[PDB]
Amino acid sequence: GTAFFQQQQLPAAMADTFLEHLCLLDIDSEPVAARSTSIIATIGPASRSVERLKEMIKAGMNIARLNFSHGSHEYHAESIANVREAVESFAGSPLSYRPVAIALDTKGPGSGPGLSEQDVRDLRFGVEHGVDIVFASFVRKASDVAAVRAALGPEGHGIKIISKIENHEGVKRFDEILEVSDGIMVARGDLGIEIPAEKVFLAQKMMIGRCNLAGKPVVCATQMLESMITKPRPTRAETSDVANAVLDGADCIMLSGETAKGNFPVEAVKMQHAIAREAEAAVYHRQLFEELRRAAPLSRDPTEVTAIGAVEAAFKCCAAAIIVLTTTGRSAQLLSRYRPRAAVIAVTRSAQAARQVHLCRGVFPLLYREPPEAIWADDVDRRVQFGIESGKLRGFLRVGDLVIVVTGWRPGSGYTNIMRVLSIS
Amino acid sequence: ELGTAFFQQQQLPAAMADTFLEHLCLLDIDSEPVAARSTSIIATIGPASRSVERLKEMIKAGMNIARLNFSHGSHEYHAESIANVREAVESFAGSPLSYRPVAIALDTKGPGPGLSEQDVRDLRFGVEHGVDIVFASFVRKASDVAAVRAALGPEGHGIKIISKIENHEGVKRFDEILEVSDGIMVARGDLGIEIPAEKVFLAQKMMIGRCNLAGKPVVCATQMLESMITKPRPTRAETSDVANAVLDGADCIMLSGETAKGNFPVEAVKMQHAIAREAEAAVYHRQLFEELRRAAPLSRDPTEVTAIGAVEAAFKCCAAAIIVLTTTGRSAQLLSRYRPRAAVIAVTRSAQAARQVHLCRGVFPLLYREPPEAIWADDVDRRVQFGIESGKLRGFLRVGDLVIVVTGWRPGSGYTNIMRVLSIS
Amino acid sequence: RADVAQLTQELGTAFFQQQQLPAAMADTFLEHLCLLDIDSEPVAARSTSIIATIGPASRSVERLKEMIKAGMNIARLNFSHGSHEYHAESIANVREAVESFAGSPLSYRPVAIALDTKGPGSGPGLSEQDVRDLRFGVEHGVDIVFASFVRKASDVAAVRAALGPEGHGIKIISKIENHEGVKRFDEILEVSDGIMVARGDLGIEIPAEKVFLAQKMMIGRCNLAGKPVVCATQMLESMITKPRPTRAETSDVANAVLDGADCIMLSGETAKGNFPVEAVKMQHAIAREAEAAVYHRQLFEELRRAAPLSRDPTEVTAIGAVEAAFKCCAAAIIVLTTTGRSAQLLSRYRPRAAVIAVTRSAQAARQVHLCRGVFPLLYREPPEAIWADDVDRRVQFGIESGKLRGFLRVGDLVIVVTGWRPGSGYTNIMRVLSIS
Amino acid sequence: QQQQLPAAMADTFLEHLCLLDIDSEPVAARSTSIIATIGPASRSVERLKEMIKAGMNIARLNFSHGSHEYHAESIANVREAVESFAGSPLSYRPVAIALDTKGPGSGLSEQDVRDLRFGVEHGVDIVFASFVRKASDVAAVRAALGPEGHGIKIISKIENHEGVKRFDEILEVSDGIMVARGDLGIEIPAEKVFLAQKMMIGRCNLAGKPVVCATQMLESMITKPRPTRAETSDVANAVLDGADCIMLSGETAKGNFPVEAVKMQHAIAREAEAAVYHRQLFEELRRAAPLSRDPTEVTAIGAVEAAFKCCAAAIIVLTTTGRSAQLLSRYRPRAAVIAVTRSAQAARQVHLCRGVFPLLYREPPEAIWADDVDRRVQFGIESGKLRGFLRVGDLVIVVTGWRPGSGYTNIMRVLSIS
Ligand SMILES: O=C1c2ccccc2C(=O)c2cc(S(=O)(=O)O)c(O)cc21
Ligand SMILES: O=C1c2ccccc2C(=O)c2cc(S(=O)(=O)O)c(O)cc21
Ligand SMILES: O=P(O)(O)OC[C@H]1O[C@](O)(COP(=O)(O)O)[C@@H](O)[C@@H]1O
Ligand SMILES: O=P(O)(O)OC[C@H]1O[C@](O)(COP(=O)(O)O)[C@@H](O)[C@@H]1O
Ligand SMILES: O=P(O)(O)OC[C@H]1O[C@](O)(COP(=O)(O)O)[C@@H](O)[C@@H]1O
Ligand SMILES: O=P(O)(O)OC[C@H]1O[C@](O)(COP(=O)(O)O)[C@@H](O)[C@@H]1O
Ligand SMILES: O=C([O-])C(=O)[O-]
Ligand SMILES: O=C([O-])C(=O)[O-]
Ligand SMILES: O=C([O-])C(=O)[O-]
Ligand SMILES: O=C([O-])C(=O)[O-]
Ligand SMILES: [K+]
Ligand SMILES: [K+]
Ligand SMILES: [K+]
Ligand SMILES: [K+]
Ligand SMILES: [Mg+2]
Ligand SMILES: [Mg+2]
Ligand SMILES: [Mg+2]
Ligand SMILES: [Mg+2]
């Protein structure tokens, strides 16, 4: 229908130049797709109540950040328990349940150059409490990441390390830090004090570009909706900053004081949700996909080869979704790196992977709870059907839509190799 | 890894170029072709090439399609030539490395306001003798194609109709002719008499471009190696013409007097084979694939969606082949329209489809004769392994290579929707 | 590497590490982003004009001199506040501060005066206060009018009529502040001299999360039309009370410049805030960084592809001059102009080279601040007897002022744009000159 | 519309091909020069006049055949035929004289030294140097031309594997290149010649140096009045590849249809030039051309850009050595580059550059240099109007310098005709 091609900035998406794409942007072209940039909300006094956390999950919070620069271990353990209680209150309806990751943000090393003794204790707390992600403060070189990895021990091998780049050295040694990290956070608060304030946008755009090229998650953080700590509506510069972080290519956007101590934590999450949806529809996919394809090197890994084939197939038919089965989240991450317009519905049995895939733009995790079928092919199908049924209930899919299904040839992680075109019935 | 020597062969340095101009500058006479020749050679069978022994040499030199010119000879003469082609083809039905399907094409005498009486009788002869293709002379409009189609009677609706464009009217009404035809022949001999000789190259390039866009076979014909009718080596203009027809995007190249009446029919086939191999490696795939992608409209047909995904996947890993299961040849044709560098190995149970897929550039037919397996999934596996084993035998594949496999979810033609990445064991 | 090797040996590796030149050479926008370097210092003069609202904190002659030195190019008078007497005193103080630097072309900096109207209310036509304020503007010789709540082409015709026969030279910049203005944008742009994305009211009239779409669309369409576009309101809002802005604020200023805005504005930051000079300095610092980060390769190609063919010699000469400037890394394009039009046509192709506009019109020197990258030089000398000698003196004036202001250095190449006969509308010549 | 303008507007090369129309007639003057080998079949003054009218721009003398006396008579006949049209200065066509050497045997041969000296003594404009395999071969030819042959253009013939492999060093010291396909097709596999031709044409286009496509282009026309389909395609594809010149050997030297062979190359080249996809070509030439601080180079790109913006009918350039016209030509404008020169040698040599139309200025000098420049500009306009290049109302780009003498081009002006 003509109405379909007038929504989600589709006239602007057809444009032959980026300039014509901008000229075709329409404020009356409503967003259709689900919001794909994850929202990280920092947990504090304004956001610890189980009932308030349920409202934040419904507003769109995907990752709960625990800032270990404030509070004690006892305070953060209660935060974790309240988050888990609010999250599990929706587990009774498995088709609508929303996993929420728990990220520990470290205090950092201060005047010290190595891992501080408090960071070692906080990192061991994180492993003991089952955190999914570590936002490592003031990462300046690859050996800082190795020290964080060592302090997590053998039981914290699955935790994702997102390196916070907050000073000149971190920016200059970016490539070596990215290589050993799972992702990056553009920590603009300290970065804007360590380097001239007028240069932060260059560092943000450079880091987001490099992370997009590497296929690794990148978080844009600090003062995105600062005025919403005390005011019900943000400034024009604030909404523009959120939209531009999404247009830059950020996988995640963050709220600090806006959710930790402000008077409008739920409204701040709703605002980031609303802006991100508008900005994602305004992304010029024609140039973005072409450039991501061109820049990505050749690969002999079947997961990587299947992912590019699936993204290309999704664009060819305007697929509503790519449903992928994943153990560690890696197959969903490799789909996400090509920035499909189609939602990547990741079906997993790993509760940790379901939480961690929120770091990847456009990945919608579904935690499958059913016990395995005796016939492996029947177990793969029931999981694909669970992805379809959840997608229909959540509005991602409708009867008649085309979907791309990404699976593997045998059980266990690392064997994704099949892409299939499926019609929704 | 593949090694530096791998990336110096088959014009791979020129293939990596960021502009067409840089691509030309990087062409290297020392960069040897490795891939199998993908542009089919059509040889006209006549006095100089009728004998079974001579036909065996032409099959070994590279002839894929035997053309019978019904402007000369008689039904009895052409029936003997067809029987001799079939005898030469079946002489290799033992050795798997040597059995190659050869299509039989009937070229009509031509047209009054409809089909000539002799054309009606010759078309009936073609149906009775089981020809695969009809090269229809002097097609001027869509109703000329309908008359040939009607003449192919109740038993020959599977015969491919390749319309010969030989006059101003055929060029002007090209779009309507292409729409109802299976493919096109740029019949340069008569075209060069009907329109100014200096305009033929415009008509050839236009028709090849439009056929490439439509995903339909296009043949470049007449005077390609003309001087080889009397001389053992062609002129510099002749080798250039063959190379340029391949670079233009022709699916097939033809020999007329060169093979029908000249003194060097086998040498003419060998020469076209040598030039086509060199010219295919010099194709600028980066721009070609991007432009085929951009120009091709969105599709909700799973075969078309799977084909673009499979070709994208093949480029990502430098796949040695795309093995496709096809009954009518359509799935192989849809892969061929995206011009993959990988060979498209079409595994079929149909002898007719195996002969007819020679019209599509880069399609290597394998006729499969084993009795069916009771379990359909096992029968599919048996054919995929037939394609892999034939490939290892013919040189295409080695253990450790990656191949793309294209199948459907259920038996019967028209359900292609799966693309799998396999590692050769 | 081969397309920059000879110029790299000549100008040096240090030259090609500054002003985001490695990022400028990139073959894709993604590679361009990856190559952005915080250690690559900006060298070029700041080309996006700063509009500062003059009010209680920025009114004194001494304070205004500090703001002119910090980078203010256009002084905005908000007729939603104050009185005619109050605004006349502000204008006189701006003119006194501006004329305190008139002793030499090396120290002189023309500053435009813009009147921002109160607007219509529930009425669908020009208000009686707007008619009186517009007549005040003509009587006080304002250069620009920022017309509030423009909703259709007839609104700009009403403003034009209220300016009378003596206000024909005043530029009308239509403020787009509601859904109707956005929807009827094309007809408004066609009859306006430029546009202002007035984000404060726009953010109340349409959903706040959609303002960025309207800003990017309007900037893109203005860039395509070759007409000035201003980005306004809350750019450095927190600097009204704090000496440093938020991370969202610096990002917003940089992104308005990257979007393609010709001007950026300060409202409460300079009108009532505690750091008016620091707010101007901050916009100046961010704009210089953001201009160097512009991906000129894609921008120039897209401006070329989208712009239709032209039989106007000024337009033909402008594209040739900008192409020539990119080929040699010209330090400047010196253009002779009467109305500012030849400089505006150069500016629409977004050259990296500074467009030094040499003019005798004091009003045109003030108004060309609306066009990104235009540096106005007011020529005060009486005409030479031979017109060709007069033109040559004006060209040399621009070269000597350019050398003394640091825009030009010995060994630099400059592009000179002039016409074949006197009077407006005859630009048709492009010359390549080496600086000695 | 005419001159393949619908196909020129296309957003992709594939859509450009699809839009090519056999009914879209060429309007622009033929840009690719024709080199005709002068021999027994084309030696007479009367025959040479018909070849000049058919489109011959460069006369090639093959020093592998004949004698010095034979070639001197051929040269005199060419000059006599050329000067028979000098009575009408606004339509006169300069014709270059090129000497093609016999080549080495195993260094520069003694016969080549004598033939090169003959060329200097007879005032040849170009030398097609046979079997160039390294930069030192070009230096030897240059030295054998002596101090009086400093102005002769050396076009290196690439005819073997070594010449192809050492191409970059040969191009660096040569004025241009000839893809000598006859010997190249014997020295390397015949099926690889097209790769060497396309690579060499691409590199010459990038370097801004003339490239000639030669041998067997219309071979069958030695005995037949019409060429084969492969032959017309080969000529069209050499033009589409980017060749500045196309050549005729036996077709004009010993064949039965020398005038028809020239007419055929003229007809094909005109059609192929209109089918060039300028949108991609200009952008790629621009992207690849390095940054430059040379005002002639800077003015040339500005002039070509300005010509495309207004669909200028021509770029009129004043040139002493032909260099300013060559720098315009390297950007492949659709507009004709009308080169107004006082140098008869430069007028002949500038035929090596695609799209350059030389006008030999023989009008009286004006007293004031500025007035003299303006009259040379008006001469280009009047010749253009008479020859069909220009009409009243057209826009032209005029390229001049700031002071007399070679090397000072720095001005581009936009002018409306009449
Ligand atoms: O002499 C021919 C002949 C004689 C007797 C029976 C058949 C043939 C025959 O098929 C043929 C085809 C071509 S062409 O390549 O189609 O032009 C010829 O040029 C010449 C003959
Ligand atoms: O208090 C103000 C004032 C008081 C008395 C006379 C004039 C002014 C005045 O011009 C102004 C402008 C702005 S704004 O930047 O336009 O929003 C303000 O925010 C506040 C004032
Ligand atoms: O993305 P990952 O972690 O590599 O997981 C993908 C794996 O998931 C599967 O699709 C399903 O495997 P399981 O049945 O073990 O869940 C495997 O075939 C595939 O290898
Ligand atoms: O190219 P075609 O003619 O549509 O054939 C493709 C068909 O071949 C298959 O892959 C195998 O089918 P069969 O087992 O019937 O041969 C089907 O799943 C698919 O529909
Ligand atoms: O930019 P504008 O308003 O068109 O003015 C450009 C004009 O200035 C000139 O360069 C010089 O004109 P004046 O001598 O009248 O100042 C003219 O040749 C040209 O027409
Ligand atoms: O192309 P070339 O050899 O540099 O010649 C261009 C020269 O011709 C001119 O346009 C005219 O000079 P002359 O008066 O010497 O003929 C010069 O201004 C310029 O330097
Ligand atoms: O630590 C942080 O989040 C910061 O510095 O912005
Ligand atoms: O009929 C043909 O083959 C021709 O005319 O080229
Ligand atoms: O009028 C204004 O400046 C606004 O609305 O932002
Ligand atoms: O000498 C030549 O011209 C050749 O060999 O092609
Ligand atoms: K912290
Ligand atoms: K026939
Ligand atoms: K106002
Ligand atoms: K010779
Ligand atoms: Mg910090
Ligand atoms: Mg025919
Ligand atoms: Mg307002
Ligand atoms: Mg030779």
Side-chain angles (χ1 to χ4, degrees), chain D residues 346-370:
Chain D
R348 294 187 291 267
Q349 293 172 336
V350 98
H351 280 309
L352 287 166
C353 304
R354 188 201 277 191
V356 183
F357 300 88
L359 302 187
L360 186 56
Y361 193 69
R362 282 304 181 254
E363 298 192 357
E366 292 283 314
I368 302 171
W369 184 80

Side-chain angles (χ1 to χ4, degrees), chain D residues 81 162 329 338 340 416:
Chain D
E162 200 188 352
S329 167
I338 300 178
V340 176
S416 189

Side-chain angles (χ1 to χ4, degrees), chain D residues 62-106:
Chain D
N62 193 358
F63 275 60
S64 292
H65 309 279
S67 68
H68 285 198
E69 286 201 331
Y70 191 90
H71 293 307
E73 193 188 338
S74 293
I75 297 174
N77 285 354
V78 170
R79 292 171 172 163
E80 187 184 327
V82 173
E83 298 314 307
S84 78
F85 304 102
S88 308
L90 304 157
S91 67
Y92 167 86
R93 288 141 129 157
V95 170
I97 292 179
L99 188 147
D100 189 302
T101 71
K102 205 157 152 169
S106 284

Side-chain angles (χ1 to χ4, degrees), chain C residues 76 78-80 116-118 148 175:
Chain C
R76 170 176 174 262
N78 192 358
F79 276 59
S80 292
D116 189 303
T117 71
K118 193 170 197 171
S148 299
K175 297 172 58 179

Side-chain angles (χ1 to χ4, degrees), chain D residues 60 157 159 180-183 215:
Chain D
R60 170 176 175 261
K157 298 173 56 180
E159 339 200 37
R181 302 187 310 177
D183 287 297
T215 308

Side-chain angles (χ1 to χ4, degrees), chain A residues 18 32 44 59 65 100 112 133 151 157 184-185 202-203 205 219-220 226 236 288 337 341 344 348 355 373 382:
Chain A
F18 182 65
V32 170
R65 173 175 173 258
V100 171
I133 303 159
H157 60 284
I184 290 287
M185 177 192 295
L202 299 159
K205 292 170 183 278
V219 179
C220 182
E226 197 76 347
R236 305 310 177 275
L288 184 55
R337 78 174 289 176
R341 184 176 296 266
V344 173
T348 187
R355 294 187 292 264
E373 296 279 311
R382 259 189 103 200

Side-chain angles (χ1 to χ4, degrees), chain A residues 5 14-16 284 286 289-290 293-294 296-302 304-306 308-310 312-318 338 400-402 404 409 417-423, chain B residues 2 7 16-18 284 286 289-290 293-294 296-302 304-306 308-310 312-318 338 400-402 404 417-423:
Chain A
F5 286 105
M14 315 283 187
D16 310 301
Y284 189 34
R286 176 181 294 206
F289 183 52
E290 253 162 44
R293 266 206 333 107
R294 236 176 210 254
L298 304 172
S299 177
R300 308 237 308 142
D301 172 37
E304 183 86 70
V305 173
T306 305
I308 197 168
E312 181 68 78
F315 277 118
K316 183 64 174 189
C317 64
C318 255
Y338 292 107
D401 272 333
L402 277 190
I404 307 297
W409 61 275
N417 80 320
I418 315 178
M419 180 235 108
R420 111 175 78 110
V421 185
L422 174 65
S423 213
Chain B
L2 308 178
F7 286 104
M16 316 281 302
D18 310 301
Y284 188 34
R286 177 181 293 207
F289 183 54
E290 251 159 47
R293 258 160 80 224
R294 232 174 91 102
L298 301 177
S299 177
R300 305 238 317 155
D301 171 36
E304 182 82 56
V305 174
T306 303
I308 197 166
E312 179 73 71
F315 276 118
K316 182 66 168 192
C317 65
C318 264
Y338 293 108
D401 276 355
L402 280 193
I404 307 301
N417 77 323
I418 293 167
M419 183 264 290
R420 281 151 56 211
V421 182
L422 304 187
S423 171

